[PDB]
Amino acid sequence: NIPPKARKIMQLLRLLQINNGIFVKFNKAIKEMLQVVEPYVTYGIPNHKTVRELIYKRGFGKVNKQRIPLSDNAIIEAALGKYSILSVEDLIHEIYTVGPNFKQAANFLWPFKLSSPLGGWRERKFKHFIEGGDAGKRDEHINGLVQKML
Amino acid sequence: ALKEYQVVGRKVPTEHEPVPKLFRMRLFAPNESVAKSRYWYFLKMINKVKKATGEIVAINEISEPKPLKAKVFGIWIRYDSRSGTHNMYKEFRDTTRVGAVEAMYADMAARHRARFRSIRILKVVEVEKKEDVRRNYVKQLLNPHLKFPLPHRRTKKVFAPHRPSTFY
Amino acid sequence: SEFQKVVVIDAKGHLLGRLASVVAKQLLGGQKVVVVRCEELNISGHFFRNKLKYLAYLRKACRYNPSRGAFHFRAPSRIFQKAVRGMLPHKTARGQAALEHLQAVEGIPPPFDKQKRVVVPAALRVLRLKPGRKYCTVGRLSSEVGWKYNDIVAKLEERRKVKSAAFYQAKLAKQKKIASAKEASPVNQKLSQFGY
Amino acid sequence: VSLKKKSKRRTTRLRSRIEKKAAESKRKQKRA
RNA sequence: GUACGUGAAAUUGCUGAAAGGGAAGCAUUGGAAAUCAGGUCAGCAUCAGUUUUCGGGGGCGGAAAAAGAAUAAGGGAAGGUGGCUGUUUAUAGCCCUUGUUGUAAUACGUCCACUGGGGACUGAGGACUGCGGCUUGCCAAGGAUGCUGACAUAAUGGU
RNA sequence: CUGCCGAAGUUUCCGGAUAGCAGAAACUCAGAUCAGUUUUAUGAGUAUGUAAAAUGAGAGUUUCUAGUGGGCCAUUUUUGGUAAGCAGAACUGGCGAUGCGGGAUGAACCGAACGUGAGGUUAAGGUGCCGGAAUGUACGCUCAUCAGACGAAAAGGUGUUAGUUCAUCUAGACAGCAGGACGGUGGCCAUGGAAGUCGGAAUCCGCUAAGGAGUGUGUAACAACUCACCUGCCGAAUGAACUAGCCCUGAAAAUGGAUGGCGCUUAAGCGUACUACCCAUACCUCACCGUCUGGGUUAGCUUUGAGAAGCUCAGACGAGUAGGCAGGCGUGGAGGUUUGUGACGAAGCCUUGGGCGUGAGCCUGGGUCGAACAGCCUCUAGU
RNA sequence: GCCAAGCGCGACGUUGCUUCGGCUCUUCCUAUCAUACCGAAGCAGAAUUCGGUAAGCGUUGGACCCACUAAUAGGGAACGUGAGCUGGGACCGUCGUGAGACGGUUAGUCCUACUGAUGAAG
RNA sequence: AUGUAUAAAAAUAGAGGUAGGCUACUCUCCUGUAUCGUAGAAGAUGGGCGAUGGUUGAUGAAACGGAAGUGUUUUAUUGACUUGUCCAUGAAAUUCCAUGAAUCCAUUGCAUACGACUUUA
């Protein structure tokens, strides 16, 4: 029960499954796209712990169109060495600081397949975050949600 | 758990208004995200300032300066009802401005079944002089010899052996 | 907390549904429950309202052999048993075995008048009803809808209270003697450090 | 039991037409 | 044994076993009884994977929390104390401001490539390669081993 | 029997073609193009159309060949309306090909989309008992002799609770007691008569602290009583009009019946806030099955693993109607083969014996039985 | 139309003349004719009228009547009880002006409640 | 089943006492997380010391319990045990979890479709 417009947008965001997370570069085109699918996703500003823990624990790279885990630095070097991203920490730095090769780094990362949040959601999950729900922008509270889904 | 937030904001500088006026509001919300949303709502409905054209320049939680001093707080609110246009004034006795607002929200949702979004707090003031108190139940609280037996006492371990004392 | 193999519950001052809900769960848990003084149970709401509720219940009847209709039981224990029975899966063999573990009676017959009677704080009227709220007694409700043994239970209960009081005085007198002789033994103060 | 003269709980067809009655009220106010 | 090779099912009688309070059949999980195949089943430890639940310690942040306490100024009064309804700390005290004790503490938020326990499920793979750590070797480092028991005249797995 | 792919659900022209959606075959294309998407810019009228950054995905055509051409439901805009219904479009949604959790029960409601499993965690909804889970925490409201748990409407209630406004108040608040409540004047007409109070017009007045051409009772008419207004005793708050919540009313008959039930009343009702907890086929990790996709595999290396139709590594995926594609099971007969089985028991049959396969099915023990039958490779069909 | 608390409407008020149809039967509803009890009215008494509670109990016999009667109340069982019961054609063709008739096919679809009777058995 | 251990009554905007003369006292409540009971080869064998009690088994009883009294006491014995306080032996390799009438046949007719019912024998 998704309108076709939202379905296309979440396809561009690669959010093809519930509880799937991705990193996005926040700009005009992203800001308004997130506005359209705002009832269907929640987004916020991740801190360094959130980014580092996502890539270490749930980090998988798209290599030869395959979901290869980020188990060794050679995997990242072989796939992102053209942009001088040699290790996991370099990949974290590129994502966190939004470097020049953010698009290549983010697209290399497979969308994160988060679990259900330990402790549950709010009682009515499909209301806006401001209105006591969980949908929409939630600023730095995306961190607390992520530690629930890790 | 509500929190009192000082939110100061203004429209983005432009050639027509290189020094925009900074507007401040003391408003209550569970978190900063809700407070900044409520601030934008009030600013739009008063000054017609668009959210996109504006920006939040400061957000600060305000703790109670004297949380251990019992006070009386008078709150003016714009009650939204079936007709959607009503003004009310209420007085609550407690030690924190946040607590009085929390009691205000619970009371209004209880008596008048008014939601958080329908209610908008207009002003909260601390009535320090006993004489300006307008409520009889509050005045009975400020009497010097206030003393009363405890009401609504009521008190797994099912199957108690004896009967409850439910007294002194 | 803890169970007993057989539990005697003094229903005086309790609430019908609140006691029934606790009892029904205890029966399903495999416990045997005896409820005494079912004529002293209380129900929230004034008598006339509760009387009208019973009259509406009596009204259910068929046009083909009212014997096929619902059997309306007037005894206070039967009223309580009806409340418990509706809280059990009685069409199911588990619920049937739950019912057979319940024994609700009016007054306290001899096999139980010499046994301890616990109470359920979750169902006591004093701890559950705001003072000044109208309530009725099942004994009065039963006697006014057809129950015809209110006086016999009343008379028999007065005699039991007299005999119970006489037993208590003997027990109390005995307890005083042990209470007096308790401090006679020096050890009670010698090592009272353990809290005993 | 209930002391009422009608079942307070209606039928699914009855509640369904109440949402239709709510639809009528919207028609009365908005367009009609 | 000509009601004649083999002799299915429907159906019927008999015996045995069991079930049965206004349907029955069925599915799932086990129990009981009966019967089959005939290594099985346990406990702990040290690890790996997933996970849940309690703690401890320490950074950083905000009004560099607010308070508060203790202690110096001044101000005000009360729901007015001692005193004498009215007043201004006395034979109770309270409120406001400032100083101080201060770099106070604490709560909350956040972080630790800080740390100590409890529980559960899982053990795929099958010489050696690899990435690493400690130092040829050793290792929690490309997926479980070790130490014991008990029990086979039964447990397990069935039907 | 299993597996894989998988619609259309209807335009556009005359029941047929074209196209669309789905596949196949054969090509070219990765310094390329696409998109049920959003920005930026241009103009034009918050939208519009045109062009040019973000994000995602390898993107393109040709042939030719299936099936489809309905409906139902709902939102919004709008066109009219009519006692009131509704009627007409457009719009994209949901069903339709689709199980599952919840809503007591359900074609259209809330969640969620499906290989076989173990564990963990959730959605929606819930935590008195039936029923897994707090007879939790905190603040209120509500008492119904037809509560509540889910149009009849305009209103009515000496029902309760908050407020909003306006009034008086130690010059004594209301309320109650003690009184006054007068004089012209029985003001003027009217009639058995009405002297304030049958009635019709006036509605003046002096005195006060205040007394009307009278508030009602009363009277044949007075008189008498009463209050409008004042005075004293008493000593502080009191009154009027509105708003909002909940409660009763604001009709409906014809065996007994429904918040699903039991029951529930400082709820187990209504409103809010805060924690904890319960479980879906959903989410996470893992194992296994299958399919797809990508990589590797011959001087066939003493790792021996070349039925190359084999072996191996990795990742993703799993509903499915019409339709399309693939691989298997079984039966009668034929050619070949198994140095094939068999009176020491073929075939068949029976069996609470065992085993294998996802399955179609196969193998086997025991019994009965008495003369023939099977595996493999191919052929064939009255399969 | 006049007002018209109020929110151009505008309530209460005010002006304006003007096939169906019925026998039996079973129950049930009260929106009650009688019976029981109350309230009001110039209700003296008597007989009433009107209004409440109330469905316990009744609500006939004969042809608009009729007489009896305490009274001869109103309805339901959506096709009341026709499975208790009875009464009061279409197509095609042919001839056809404004008009109507003279045909060929045709086409119907145990079980249990209740009433009593036995009855094994803790 | 694993201690199958616990009997006042009433009130909850009050009770219960103690000590007093329905009235003057003070104390207690604020649940059972209490009280009773609890050492011993499932509980062995003896010896002291100190109670002079406790727990029972088997008899003999008399009083009490009728609401479903099936149990309460008081005991007169007898047989045991006693941990009240101390001692001395024994324990194991089970060497790490598993535990006299009625009926039929007859008779009646107070009854009857058939059974049943009432009789008689």
From Swiss-Prot, chain A:
Keywords: Cytoplasm, Nucleus, Ribonucleoprotein, Ribosomal protein. It is found in: Cytoplasm; Nucleus, Nucleolus. Component of the large ribosomal subunit (LSU). Mature yeast ribosomes consist of a small (40S) and a large (60S) subunit. The 40S small subunit contains 1 molecule of ribosomal RNA (18S rRNA) and at least 33 different proteins. The large 60S subunit contains 3 rRNA molecules (25S, 5.8S and 5S rRNA) and at least 46 different proteins. Component of the ribosome, a large ribonucleoprotein complex responsible for the synthesis of proteins in the cell. The small ribosomal subunit (SSU) binds messenger RNAs (mRNAs) and translates the encoded message by selecting cognate aminoacyl-transfer RNA (tRNA) molecules. The large subunit (LSU) contains the ribosomal catalytic site termed the peptidyl transferase center (PTC), which catalyzes the formation of peptide bonds, thereby polymerizing the amino acids delivered by tRNAs into a polypeptide chain. Its main location: cytoplasm. Signal peptide: none annotated. It comes from Schizosaccharomyces pombe (strain 972 / ATCC 24843). GO terms for molecular function: RNA binding; structural constituent of ribosome. GO terms for cellular component: cytoplasm; cytosolic large ribosomal subunit; nucleolus; preribosome. One of its GO terms (biological process) is cytoplasmic translation. Belongs to the universal ribosomal protein uL30 family. This is Large ribosomal subunit protein uL30B.
Swiss-Prot record, chain B:
One of its GO terms (cellular component) is cytosol. It holds the Pfam family Ribosomal_L18A. Its main location: cytoplasm. GO terms for molecular function: structural constituent of ribosome. It is found in: Cytoplasm. Component of the ribosome, a large ribonucleoprotein complex responsible for the synthesis of proteins in the cell. The small ribosomal subunit (SSU) binds messenger RNAs (mRNAs) and translates the encoded message by selecting cognate aminoacyl-transfer RNA (tRNA) molecules. The large subunit (LSU) contains the ribosomal catalytic site termed the peptidyl transferase center (PTC), which catalyzes the formation of peptide bonds, thereby polymerizing the amino acids delivered by tRNAs into a polypeptide chain. There are 2 genes for eL20 in S.pombe. This is Large ribosomal subunit protein eL20A. It comes from Schizosaccharomyces pombe (strain 972 / ATCC 24843).
Swiss-Prot record, chain C:
Gene3D superfamilies: 6.10.250.3250, Ribosomal protein L13 (3.90.1180.10). CDD domains: Ribosomal_L13. One of its GO terms (molecular function) is mRNA binding. It is found in: Cytoplasm. PANTHER family: LARGE RIBOSOMAL SUBUNIT PROTEIN UL13 (PTHR11545:SF3), RIBOSOMAL PROTEIN L13 (PTHR11545). Component of the large ribosomal subunit (LSU). Mature yeast ribosomes consist of a small (40S) and a large (60S) subunit. The 40S small subunit contains 1 molecule of ribosomal RNA (18S rRNA) and at least 33 different proteins. The large 60S subunit contains 3 rRNA molecules (25S, 5.8S and 5S rRNA) and at least 46 different proteins. This is Large ribosomal subunit protein uL13B. The gene is rpl1601.
From Swiss-Prot, chain D:
Disruption phenotype: 20-40% of cells exhibit morphogenetic aberrations represented by irregular, uneven, or overdeposition of septum material as well as septation and cell separation defects, often resulting in pseudofilamentous or multiseptated cells, suggesting a failure of cytokinesis in those cells. Cultures of null mutant cells did not appear to exhibit a growth arrest. It comes from the Eukaryota. Signal peptide: none annotated. Residues 16-26 have a biased composition (Basic and acidic residues). Residues 1-15 have a biased composition (Basic residues). It is found in: Nucleus, Nucleolus. In contrast to other GTP-binding proteins, this family is characterized by a circular permutation of the GTPase motifs described by a G4-G1-G3 pattern. Required for optimal growth. Required for normal processing of ribosomal pre-rRNA. Required for nuclear export of ribosomal protein rpl2501. Belongs to the TRAFAC class YlqF/YawG GTPase family. This is GTPase grn1. It comes from Schizosaccharomyces pombe (strain 972 / ATCC 24843). The lineage of its organism: Eukaryota, Fungi, Dikarya, Ascomycota, Taphrinomycotina.
